[PDB]
């Protein structure tokens, strides 16, 4: 089994 | 004998926004890309039944770029822009729309690559409907 | 030294009753202030502080992003819960129970009986004091549950006493790692 | 509830330091070494049942650094207000003379996450066997950290967990020594 990561989003510019 | 059941659709006069279910939100509106596909005309009713205070929406040049960037590369939407009155290209929302019209006057859609709504080959093609509801 | 700027991002999966209920909480924190968050029970991003307004608006305008987070409770939370369930939710280490008085004093003079419970896991644990068979609820000075940082806990539960010859104090411990409550005595 | 799994990450300026770790009910499951670019499990037993692609963490951190830049400006450069740490030195299990034990230095409720920690035996620094954890997150968004010093109990030695942090006026020494 592999740990799934949640991706960080880029903030509003 | 002809049994006539008429249906007049108009803009909504109330507020609503289904937060656990809308396609995307922008400015004051809650947008919903229909899951079932429909004929352009079937859209007025499809939207009016999707959620309370919801209706077939015509993308303003201020709004379709957001609608357009939320489109798959192969996905298109029937939009509530029609040929009849007020500049001749209007919406349940009023106004005048600039339309790419090399075709038949009655239906319009948006694609990922269109910058204005577009008139179509024929309105029987099935497509998801672009619906809206005003929040708060 | 110079001023510091901190940016924190936390994705928290809350599991209730195993997996029958799972809430996902995504939080953005600037320095020490949460600014924006996604709550799976809400469905969209919500600005907590004004600094987060721009972000909540921008993120709720992206459908793919919205669709991804709204399914994360399954593709992320429930998934990772499985990947490590065998050694986290199921991890169990029996406590080591020792009883000793703090300072070696002659009898009849006030003393602090110490019940050390160490190296256990999970944290859920119960320690009770007994004086000749009857439960002592009063005069119990405890440290509370202490997390050691290496998946083991410990707790020191002290009992105020004035031991009279013949008295038998018993420290009873109950913990999900043991079937029948552990016990250890100390003779006065 | 019952359980909580937390993916926590952060980036701090000017330090240019970051972190990426997974937490289960308060305990660290693993974290990603930014330098070695490999995932490091708290208990080696964990690596024998699961795995994590460390590269993913590095991607998030890049995005976090960029975001930190954005948030700093938009906040009009307001810096974090230091919160000095609470320090307490504890023993792993009841001590017995000449029975190996472990001194736990528990640093809690502080921010930002930068701290210089030193173990001292009779006023001299010690490294033999020392180990530490990364910064663990707290619900109030402050941090928790642990430092370890295995030692042999005696009546002849005194120890100190020396802790430095910007919210502190001067180094803080937490004292420990056998009591007979």
Domain containing residue C132 = 91-188
Q: State the chains in contact with C (3 or more Cβ–Cβ pairs under 8 Å).
A: A, B, D
Closest CA–CA distance from residue D116 to any residue of chain A (Å): 29
Q: What are the structural domains, with CATH classification, of chain B? A: 1-136 (3.10.100.10)
Identify the DSSP state of D82: P
Count of C-beta atoms within a 10 Å radius of residue D31: 24
Cβ-based contacts of B18 with chain C (< 8 Å): 43
Q: Are B26 and C61 an interchain contact pair (Cβ–Cβ within 8 Å)?
A: yes
Q: In chain C, how many domains are there?
A: 2
Task: Name every residue whose Cβ is closer than 8 Å to that of residue C161 and which is 6 or more positions away in sequence.
Answer: C110, C111, C112, C113, C131, C139, C167, C169
C82 shares a domain with C107: no
Instruction: Give the residue from B70, B25, B34 showing the smallest Cα distance to C59.
Output: B25
Cα D166 versus chain centre, distance:
16
Residue D141, token pair as written in the block: 């968004």
Task: Name every residue whose Cβ is closer than 8 Å to that of residue B73 and which is 6 or more positions away in sequence.
Answer: B112
* DSSP string over D110-154: EBSS--EEEEEETTEE--TT-EE--PEE-TTS-EEEEEEEEE---
Last residue in a domain, options C23, C55, C90: C90
**Measured distance CA(D127)–CA(D124) in Å, rounded:** 10
Q: Three-state SS for C19?
A: coil
Let me know how long chain A is: 13
Last residue in a domain, options C90, C108, C136: C90
**Measured distance CA(D95)–CA(D178) in Å, rounded:** 8
Q: What are the structural domains, with CATH classification, of chain D? A: 1-79 (3.10.320.10), 80-179 (2.60.40.10)
Instruction: Give the residue from B99, B81, B83 showing the smallest Cα distance to B91.
Output: B81
Size of interface A-D (CB pairs under 8 A): 37
**DSSP element (H, E) containing D10:** strand D3-13
- Resolution of the coordinates, Å: 2.7
φ, ψ for residue D71 (rounded to 5)? -65, -35
Residue C60, marked binder: no
Instruction: Give the residue from D47, D54, D48, D43 showing the smallest Cα distance to D9.
Output: D54
Residue tagged 């003079």 (tokens): C109
Residue B19, token pair as written in the block: 């937060």
**Measured distance CA(B8)–CA(C98) in Å, rounded:** 82
Q: Are A3 and D50 an interchain contact pair (Cβ–Cβ within 8 Å)?
A: yes
* DSSP string over C23-61: EEEEEEEETTEEEEEEETTT-SEEESSGGGHHHHHHHTT
D–B contact (≥3 CB pairs within 8 Å)? no
C131 shares a domain with C184: yes
Instruction: Give the residue from B56, B48, B50, B36 showing the smallest Cα distance to B117.
Output: B56
C164 shares a domain with C71: no
Mutate to test the interface with C, among D10, D27, D60, D167 (most CBs of C within 10 A): D27
Closest CA–CA distance from residue A9 to any residue of chain C (Å): 8
- Classify the C-alpha dihedral B86-B90-B92-B93 as positive or negative: negative
For C101-132, give one letter per residue: b (16+ CB within 10 A) or e. beeeeeeeeebebbbbbbbbbbbebebbbbbe
Let me know how long chain D is: 180
Q: State the chains in contact with D (3 or more Cβ–Cβ pairs under 8 Å).
A: A, C
Q: What's the CA dihedral at C48, C53, C54, C55 to 10 degrees?
A: 30
**DSSP element (H, E) containing D46:** helix D44-47
> In the PDB record, what is the listed experimental method?
X-ray
Residue C43, token pair as written in the block: 């469905």
Residue C133, token pair as written in the block: 């068979």
- Cis preceding linkage at D112, omega within 30: yes
C1 shares a domain with C54: yes
**Measured distance CA(C120)–CA(C124) in Å, rounded:** 9
- Classify the C-alpha dihedral D47-D50-D51-D56 as positive or negative: negative
* DSSP string over chain B: -------------SB---TTT-SEEETTEEEEEEEEEE-TTHHHHHHHHHSTT-EE----TTTHHHHHHTS-SS--EE-SEEESSSSSEEETT-S----B-SS-TT-EEE-TT-SS-EE-S-TTS-EEEEEEEE--
Residue C80, marked binder: yes
C82 shares a domain with C117: no
- Classify the C-alpha dihedral C37-C31-D25-D86 as positive or negative: negative
Q: Are D70 and A11 an interchain contact pair (Cβ–Cβ within 8 Å)?
A: yes
φ, ψ for residue D34 (rounded to 5)? -65, -40
Count of C-beta atoms within a 10 Å radius of residue C89: 17
Closest CA–CA distance from residue A3 to any residue of chain D (Å): 5
Cα D22 versus chain centre, distance:
14
A1: nearest CA partner in chain C: C83
Asked whether D32 and D134 are in contact (CB, 8 A), the reply is no
Cβ-based contacts of C147 with chain D (< 8 Å): 26-27
**Measured distance CA(B29)–CA(C4) in Å, rounded:** 39
B26: nearest CA partner in chain C: C61
C114 shares a domain with C42: no
- Classify the C-alpha dihedral B55-B61-B67-B71 as positive or negative: positive
φ, ψ for residue D101 (rounded to 5)? -145, -175
Which of A4, A9, A12 lies closest to C79 in CB terms?
A: A4
Last residue in a domain, options C47, C71, C90: C90
Listed in order, strand segments (DSSP E) in chain C are: 5-16, 21-30, 33-39, 45-47, 96-101, 111-120, 126-131, 134-136, 140-142, 146-147, 153-161, 168-174, 182-187
**Opening angle at CA D24, ends D22 and D28, nearest 5:** 55
Q: Are A1 and D51 an interchain contact pair (Cβ–Cβ within 8 Å)?
A: yes
Burial grade of C185 (CB within 10 A; 0-12, 13-18, 19 or more): exposed
Domain of C2, CATH number, reads 3.10.320.10
Residue C96, token pair as written in the block: 């080591």
Instruction: Give the residue from C30, C63, C32 showing the smallest Cα distance to C45.
Output: C63
φ, ψ for residue D74 (rounded to 5)? -60, -25
**Opening angle at CA D144, ends D150 and D134, nearest 5:** 65
Cβ-based contacts of B33 with chain C (< 8 Å): 63
Residue D75, token pair as written in the block: 């906040």
C97 shares a domain with C85: no
Which of A2, A5, A11 lies closest to D60 in CB terms?
A: A5
C112 shares a domain with C96: yes
Q: Are B24 and C44 an interchain contact pair (Cβ–Cβ within 8 Å)?
A: no
Cα C28 versus chain centre, distance:
23
Task: Name every residue whose Cβ is closer than 8 Å to that of residue C143 and which is 6 or more positions away in sequence.
Answer: C155, C156, C157
């Amino acid at each position: 089994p592999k740990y799934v990561k949640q991706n960080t989003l880029k903030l509003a510019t | 004998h002809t049994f006539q059941v008429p249906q007049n659709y108009t803009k909504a006069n109330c507020t609503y926004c289904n937060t656990r279910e809308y396609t995307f939100s922008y400015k004051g509106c809650c947008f919903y890309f229909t899951k079932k596909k429909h004929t352009w005309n079937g859209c007025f009713q499809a939207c009016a039944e999707l959620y309370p205070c919801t209706y077939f929406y015509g993308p303003t040049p201020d709004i379709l770029p957001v609608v357009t960037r939320n489109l798959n590369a192969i996905e298109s939407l029937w939009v509530g822009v029609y040929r009849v009155g007020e500049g001749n290209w209007t919406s349940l929302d009023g106004g005048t729309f600039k339309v790419y019209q090399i075709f038949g006057s009655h239906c319009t859609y948006v694609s990922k690559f269109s910058t204005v709504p577009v008139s179509h080959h024929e309105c029987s093609f099935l497509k998801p409907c672009l619906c809206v509801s005003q929040r708060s | 030294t110079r001023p510091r700027f901190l940016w924190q991002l936390k994705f928290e999966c809350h599991f209730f009753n195993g997996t029958e209920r799972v809430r996902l909480l995504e939080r953005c924190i600037y320095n020490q202030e949460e600014s924006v968050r996604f709550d799976s029970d809400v469905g969209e991003y919500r600005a907590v502080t004004e600094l987060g307004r721009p972000d909540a608006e921008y993120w709720n305008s992206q459908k793919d992003l919205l669709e991804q987070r709204r399914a994360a409770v399954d593709t992320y939370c429930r998934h990772n819960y499985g990947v490590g369930e065998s050694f986290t939710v199921q991890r169990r280490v029996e406590p080591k129970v020792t009883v000793y008085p703090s300072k070696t004093q002659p009898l009849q003079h006030h003393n602090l009986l110490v019940c050390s419970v160490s190296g256990f896991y999970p944290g859920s644990i119960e320690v009770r004091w007994f004086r000749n068979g009857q439960e002592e609820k009063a005069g119990v000075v405890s440290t509370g549950l202490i997390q050691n940082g290496d998946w083991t806990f410990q707790t020191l539960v002290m009992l105020e006493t004035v031991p009279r010859s013949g008295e038998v104090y018993t420290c009873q411990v109950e913990h999900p790692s043991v079937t029948s409550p552990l016990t250890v005595e100390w003779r006065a | 509830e019952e359980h909580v799994i937390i993916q926590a990450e952060f980036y701090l300026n000017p330090d240019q330091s970051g972190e990426f770790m997974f937490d289960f009910d308060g305990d660290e499951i693993f974290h990603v070494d930014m330098a070695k670019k490999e995932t490091v499990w708290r208990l080696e037993e964990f690596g024998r049942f699961a795995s994590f692609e460390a590269q993913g963490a590095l991607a998030n951190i890049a995005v976090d650094k960029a975001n930190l830049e954005i948030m700093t400006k938009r906040s009009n450069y307001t810096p974090i207000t230091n919160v000095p740490p609470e320090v307490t030195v504890l023993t792993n299990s009841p001590v017995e003379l000449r029975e190996p034990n472990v001194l736990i230095c528990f640093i809690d409720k502080f921010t930002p996450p930068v701290v210089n920690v030193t173990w001292l035996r009779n006023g001299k620094p010690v490294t033999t066997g020392v180990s530490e954890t990364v910064f663990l997150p707290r619900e109030d968004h402050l941090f928790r950290k642990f430092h370890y010093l295995p030692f042999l109990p005696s009546t002849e030695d005194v120890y100190d967990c020396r802790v430095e942090h910007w919210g502190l006026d001067e180094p803080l020494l937490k004292h420990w020594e056998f009591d007979a």
